[PDB]
From a paper:
Here, we report on the structure and function of haloarchaeal contractile injection systems (CISs). CISs have adapted to a range of functions, but their conserved core is composed of a sheath-tube module (also called a contractile tail), which assembles onto a baseplate. To facilitate toxin secretion, the baseplate triggers contraction of a dynamic outer sheath forcing a rigid inner tube, tipped with a spike protein, to be driven through membranes. Our first major insight was that the CIS gene cluster in Hb has a T6SS mode of action, i.e., it functions while bound to the cytoplasmic membrane.
Author numbering:
A (entry chain G): 2 to 208, 292 to 571
B (entry chain A): 367 to 571
C (entry chain M): 292 to 470
D (entry chain B): 2 to 53
E (entry chain M): 523 to 571
F (entry chain B): 471 to 522
Write the structure that this text describes.
Amino acid sequence: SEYQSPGVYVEEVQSGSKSVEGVSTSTAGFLGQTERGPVEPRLVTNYADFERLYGASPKSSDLDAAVDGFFKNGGSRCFIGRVSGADIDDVATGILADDEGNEIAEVEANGPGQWGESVAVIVEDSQYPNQFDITVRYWSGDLEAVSKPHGDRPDPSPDVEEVYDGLSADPEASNFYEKQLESSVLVDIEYKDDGTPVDGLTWLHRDVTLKDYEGVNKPGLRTGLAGFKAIDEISMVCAPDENDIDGLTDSIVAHCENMGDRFAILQSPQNPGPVSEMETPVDSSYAAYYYPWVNVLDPVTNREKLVPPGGHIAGIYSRTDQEHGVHKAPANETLRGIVGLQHNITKGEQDVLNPKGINCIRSFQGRGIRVWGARTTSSDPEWKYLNVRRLFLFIEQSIQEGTQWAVFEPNEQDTWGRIRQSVTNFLRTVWRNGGLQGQSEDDAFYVKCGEETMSEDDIDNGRLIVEIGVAPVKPAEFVIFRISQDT
Amino acid sequence: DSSYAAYYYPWVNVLDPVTNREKLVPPGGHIAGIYSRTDQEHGVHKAPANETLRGIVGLQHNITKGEQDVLNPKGINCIRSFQGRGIRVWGARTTSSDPEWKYLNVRRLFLFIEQSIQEGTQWAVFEPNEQDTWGRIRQSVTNFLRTVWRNGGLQGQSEDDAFYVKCGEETMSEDDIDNGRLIVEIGVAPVKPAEFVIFRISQDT
Amino acid sequence: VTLKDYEGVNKPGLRTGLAGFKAIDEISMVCAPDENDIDGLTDSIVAHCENMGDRFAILQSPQNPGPVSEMETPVDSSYAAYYYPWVNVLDPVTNREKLVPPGGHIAGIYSRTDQEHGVHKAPANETLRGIVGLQHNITKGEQDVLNPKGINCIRSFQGRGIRVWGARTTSSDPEWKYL
Amino acid sequence: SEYQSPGVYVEEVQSGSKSVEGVSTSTAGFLGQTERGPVEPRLVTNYADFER
Amino acid sequence: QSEDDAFYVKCGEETMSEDDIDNGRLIVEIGVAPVKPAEFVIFRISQDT
Amino acid sequence: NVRRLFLFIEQSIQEGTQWAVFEPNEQDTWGRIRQSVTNFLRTVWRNGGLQG
């Protein structure tokens, strides 16, 4: 500071260490087809939210089953992205009119597709002066059989119902209908002119490939994977129908490798061929591969049905992360929400599959159905185990996001000590929770920043270099007992 | 291509107090205010970057990380907007091509030091050119530079690493004394900013 | 009214708006209930509090802030706090419910906590008096996304009532994370 | 790596040793005539599999 | 648990030099340790001992 | 058994060292390779396969 006139001065100084906070690690992302809903990614925390916002899947998709398996196994949060074969602007619309026939508002469905042709909007008048009520109804089945869509009890009870009571036409009020109808899973309203609508009912009229899974990337609209790559909470991605669309596995693995902060879960085909000839599709350290398919009860036929196991496995990942940590291998855990498997694998066949990076789901007598295998598809010996990759992702993202205060700071010993202290505190916390291995701190990790890592050419060019060394913990895959008679 | 100038980009948006609408203006005065604030709360040796802009609504364009890799090595300073952090100045270089005056705070520190020395030494003109005056001048300049060092402006774990001052028979010869010249030599080591923060992480030990 | 009326007059013998407030040394927190109807007022309030250096700013979200996965705080100051959502009250001219921002109730909670506990006590896990209900009910899954972003929530627990659940600032500096 | 714009960089380094794993050593191959079956080689882990 | 853990105050010849005295500066250095809230209350329960 | 042991060792080495192709030909790679092969052979020695 500068002191030019007499007085009292109070100044604040920076302290000797700054805390780092860990990031989320149990959020998932799903892609696939639905019947209703928007095409921008939305967060879901429960299965009833999913049924309310999106509905069911068509016969060519198995998204509903995968989300159900995710939440039955202890998952916490999903990001849903809806993929649609229709143009984004193929949306049903409508108009509201005033006393003498002026269009005052414009109603639009909340997503593209033919479903918007089955939405009815009903306007009625309220008992209080200058107020009216609005109702929105949606039927999932045939419209030809709906007898009284306007009455208090239609012939088939509607699938979705929404009512808004205290509405007004004053734009500066808090009960203006544009502000109240904004939280609605069915429609959108836009204001045009001054007036209040007349009573009655009205319907909305005039309504996949690899490039749809890739998504749209425009200045104000993102779908598909382009929409996911602008969300920083997702830590694992899955596409249940990845084997019906050629060229999607590589796109998913490339997305995860280019972001550098997420993991890919892959499932085998329904018919992968002979056992002696199976291989993994990719050779990435950012993916894992599971086998075989599973059996579930179908809620529209009440019969068994064969589905891929991806969502159940993502739910197992989330559960293990919540109750043990990211350093725990998500294997030797039970699958909930299924009836049986496609095949039963023996111990002789897994001796051929396990050294190849293929993870198996097996069933033991007296113990149930469990995941038996925790490897990645990688050939590098340094990234053979899955929990090591997940721990490194967690650590690296925490460091990246929690150190932006240090840019443009003086390149001298105070900043060096501060940075060293922060990183040491974070790594000691990780060590205390069982993630690092060693009976002392010197065995588990080290951090270096000073004149041993930086030279003078570095200081003259603006570079601050920190070197960190760590020792992760690995699972026990073979438990061996050697018993003898001696001593 | 001067060492006495800095160059900022792009324009900003403000509310106009006669129309109550947005309006696009150059960012010069906001940046000068940031300079003044940083000088008041940190010192002249602190780079006036990674600081927030107050009093605006938005920018003209949003610059990405790929475009700044082309602009930054050219001496052009950018104003960017980060999600979760706001609008900030990201760059602290001069328009100069000389490698000795690449950073802005070094030039500002030298301006400060040189003007202080120029204005606070006029008592020494026409004084006797002998050892007493030499010791007096040396002592004064050493006190000033040690004060600058203690406040974080100079770099080194000891005084010998940060600066030196010389005045005597090693700087002056006899032809100098006969012609009325008193020569003082000063050497200094300024501190520079941390522009790239690098973390190299491995699995060994 | 405009932004220049909220800024106030600054003449030798007349001060209104914020120019009038900056000559009073008792004020310790400032709030403007209608800050979302006048564009450019949030920044002016945060700048006033940062330039005086002795007061704190309380901010409320809009009535329609968008999807949950896209919310952010308006500023990145250590001199401000951000609360969400709106509340319901009885209107004394119609005797009906009405939706209002929660700023004044929260300032009253600040004052109460300061009187009965001290300035070192976090003004959270405290009850809101004088309301009827909230705008939305926030779950535990949605606050896991909002809390690490500096957004403070007002929630309702069964058996315990309506309470403020969160005590952070809008700041990104790790040294000024808590209020 | 190359550093052209200011920010934070995180980089991974290769470690000082890489593990080697032993290969299988107790699998056999048989050739001869049968009454049924395919003519591509198939893996068998039990005699009932062979008869089937 | 003690005063040395909570704060310190310094003013003397460790904070001021002679160039400071000659220019009219009096420097006081204060260090403090504030208390922070309990946001996560965690109970780890086991069967051992 | 000598022939069978050599078959085992040579195939393990062949299949578990493909990361080293096109790497820099300098002291770091040398130390890394030496360390890996020494660990494998010490494991073989501890199980009674080598003599000394």
